[PDB]
Ligand binder design. Sequence first.
Ligand SMILES: [Mg+2]
Ligand SMILES: [Mg+2]
Ligand SMILES: [Zn+2]
Ligand SMILES: [Zn+2]
Ligand SMILES: [Zn+2]
Ligand SMILES: [Zn+2]
Lengths: 449, 449
Amino acid sequence: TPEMPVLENRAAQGDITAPGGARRLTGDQTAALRDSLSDKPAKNIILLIGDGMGDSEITAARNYAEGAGGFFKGIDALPLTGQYTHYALNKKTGKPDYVTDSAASATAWSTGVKTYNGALGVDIHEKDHPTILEMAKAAGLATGNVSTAELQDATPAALVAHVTSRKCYGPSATSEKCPGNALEKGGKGSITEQLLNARADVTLGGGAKTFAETATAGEWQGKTLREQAQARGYQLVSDAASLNSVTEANQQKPLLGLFADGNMPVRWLGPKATYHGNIDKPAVTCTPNPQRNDSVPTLAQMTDKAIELLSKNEKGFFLQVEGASIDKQDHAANPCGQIGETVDLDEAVQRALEFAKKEGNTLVIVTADHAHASQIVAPDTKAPGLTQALNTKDGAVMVMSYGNSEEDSQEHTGSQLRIAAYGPHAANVVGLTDQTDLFYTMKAALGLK
Amino acid sequence: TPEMPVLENRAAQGDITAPGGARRLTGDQTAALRDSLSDKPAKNIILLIGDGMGDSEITAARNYAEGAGGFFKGIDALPLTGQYTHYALNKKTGKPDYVTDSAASATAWSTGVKTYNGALGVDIHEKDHPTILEMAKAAGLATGNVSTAELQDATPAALVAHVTSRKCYGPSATSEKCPGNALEKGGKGSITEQLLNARADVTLGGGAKTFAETATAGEWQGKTLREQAQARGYQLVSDAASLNSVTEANQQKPLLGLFADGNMPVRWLGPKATYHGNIDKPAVTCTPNPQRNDSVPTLAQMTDKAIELLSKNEKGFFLQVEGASIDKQDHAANPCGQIGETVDLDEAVQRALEFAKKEGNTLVIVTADHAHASQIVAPDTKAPGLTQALNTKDGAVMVMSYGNSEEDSQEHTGSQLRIAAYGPHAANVVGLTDQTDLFYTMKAALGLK
Ligand SMILES: [Mg+2]
Ligand SMILES: [Mg+2]
Ligand SMILES: [Zn+2]
Ligand SMILES: [Zn+2]
Ligand SMILES: [Zn+2]
Ligand SMILES: [Zn+2]
C-alpha cells in the first residue's frame, strides 16, 4: 500500500561541504507523519533485533558501509522513532540493575515483566510468564523464530523457554544448573526441550550441537533431541537448498533449521582491536568471510523464507528476527565482525519492510536488547583500551574504541537506545518507553488475549 | 490550553518487579501523536542544548536522579523524537571527520553548513555564513542567547561570531590565532567584539574575564570591551538580583548578563572517577555545591527571565539556551558534576515547555551538539579507564565509566543521538536527520526568507 510510507531517502542531499548539501530532509514531514499513523489492528508482526545494536553501533556501521552521509535502506527507513529503557532488576532486592544481559532484556519484551540477569521467561520469583510467541500460537497465529546464533541462545530462547538460568541449554547443563527445570526433577525441561514442546511453525538458526544430547526422562527418554524432533513431526533442514525445498510450514509439519553446530558464521572478518591500534597499526579494510558459504542461508534469506511460509496463515503471524552476532563481535572488540553483522541485519530489515509495505497490515519493529561497548572516537585518540582505525566508504579513517573491560570481553552498557517502527500501532514506540512496553504494544496490536 | 499535548508522565506505572509495572505507557499513543502534528507557522523558537548530552548522559542522569523507572519532567516530556548525526569535515580534504568538536556542530545547526572542527560561523573555505540568530534579528524578531558557560565558548559564540578558530576570544588571542579576523588587521574582530556587534536582545552567561581586554582598534580602541558595551547602550547585569530587576530588553536597551569570570559554577560536587574506582572505593553520593549561590541565577532562572523579556516582541523570538557544563564535567570524568548539570538543564526545559504549552505557537527543541565519553556499566566491571560507583535514587549502585582517553581530558564520541521537540513543525525531528537539517527546520518554522 502506498498508504504507509517508509523513508526512501534520508541520505545527504548533495555536496556536504556546501550550504544545505548535508541535509537528509527534502521538505516538511508533518504530512508524511500523519500518514504514518494508524490505530487499525495489525495482522502480522515482524520484530527485528540487533543484539547489542545501540546508536553507536548503528552509526559506526553506517559510516563504514554507507559513509557519514549515507543511509541504511532498512534500518534507517522506519519513520517512527523513539528511545527505550532496558534496565533489569537485582534478584535479591527487586531494585534496578542498570546494565542488563541478553536474557533479562529478551524476557522483558517477550513477556512484559522485568527480571534478573540470566533469567529466561521467569520473573524474580522464578515463576513463569507466558511469552508473546506462546500467546500468538494459542490465538491461532503462525509463529516464527529466527536468529544467527545458537537457538539455545538467550535471544531466541526467550520466546519458547522458561528457565532460571540461560546456561541451561540441554539436559546435561539443566540437571546441573537448573535443577527445578530438569525434566527428571519434574521441571519443564532444558531450553532445547522447551523449544521442541513450544512447536513454533518456523524456527531457524544454529545450535545443532545441543540436539545431540539425550533425554534423561520423558516419552523420548534415552533418545537424542534430534530424534525426538523427527519423532515429533518436525521437518529438519540443514542447508540453504534444503531450506529452499520447503513449501509449507505449520503445526502438522513445523520447520526446524539447524545451519550450524554453534553460531552461524559471520559475514566479515578483520583483526581484533588492540592497544593503541589506531596509532601503531594501519587503517583496516574489512574482508568478506571466505567460509560463510553458499550452502548457508543468509539472515535475509531465512527472513524471506520465514515470511513466505508464515504468510500462508490466514489468521496472521508473529515473527522474531535476530542479528545475533553484532553483540558477540562487539564483546570481541572486532570492528569488522560487528559492522558486518549490522549490514547483514539491514538487508533482512529491507526484506521485512518490502513485505509490510505491500501487505499493509504489518507492524515492523527494529531495535536492540541493550547498548554495548563500541565508541567512535577521534583518529589520533590515545586510549587506555582497544582501538582500531578503519577505511570507510567516504575514503576516510574512522577510529573505534572498546574501553570498558580489561577482561577478555567488552561489556554491555546501560544507555537508553533507538527503537523504530512502521505499520499500525507504531506510534507506540515514539518518545520514551520501556522495553516492557514493547510486549504490551505487540500483544495489543495483534489483539491477543 | 495544551492545544498540543506534552507527555505528562512516562515513569514506570507501578511495581517494577510485577507484570506491567515497568510500563511507561497506559494505552495506545496514536491519537495523542496525531494531536502533536501541526504545520502552522511558529512565532517563537526555544532551542535547548545539553552540550555533550547523548543518550548515555541522559540515561545516567535519569537513573541517578529519578531512578531507572523515573522520568525527567522536561527532557523526557517532548513527544516527537528522533536521532541525528553531527559529523564534521576535514578542512583539507572536505571529507567527513567522524567526531565533531563543539564549534563545528554549533556552526552546523546555526548556519546550515558543515564545517571543520574549531570553526565558528564559517565554512571550510573560511567563508562567513549568516546565523539563525542574525537572520531572526534581521526579520525583526527578538533574539536570546543563554548559556552557563563563558559567552565566548563555542556554543553561544556560534550564533554571533564568525572566526577561523574558536580560541579567538578577545583581541589578544585573535591577533595571534585569527589574524584574518583581527580588528587591527581590518578583520571583523574577536568573538567578544563580534558579540557586541551582533547586539542580540538578551545575552546571559559567564566569561566576564575577556571583557577586561582593551580594543586594539575602531571607535572603542583602547577601552575595555566592558566599557564599549556600556558606551553602546547595553544594560550590564552581574547577579541574580540585578537580573531580576530588569523590566526591558530591546535593540535600544540590550541586556548583557555576566555572572562569572569564567564558566558559571556547577550545581553538584563529587570526586573525579579513578582507576578501579568502583572497586577500591565506596559509592559516591553527590552533594549540592556551596558555591552555587543565591546571587547567582540558575539556568532555569536565566531561561525564565529571557522568555519574559523576549516575549514582549509581537513578531516573535528566537532563544537558544545551553546547559554547557555537562560536556565539561564529562571531559573531566566527574559524574556528579555531569549529572547535576543534566538535572539543571531539565529544570530549564520545564520552564520552556510551560510557556510553550500556554502560548501554543512555540517550537521547543532539546538536543545535544555531539555524543560523549560516559558509559553506564555493571557494578563489578574491571575497566582500563576511570570509574566511580554512585548511590542512586533507587537505593542501588550505578557504575559510570570513562575509557576513551589516556590524556587528562575524556573525549567526545561520534554516535548519533537523541533530538526531541514539541510544537509547530516538531515533526521535522522524527526519524533520522542531520544536524544541518535543524537549521532549515527552524528557518522554515519561523518563515524566514
Ligand atoms: Mg542475542
Ligand atoms: Mg558548549
Ligand atoms: Zn544482548
Ligand atoms: Zn552480549
Ligand atoms: Zn560540545
Ligand atoms: Zn567537549
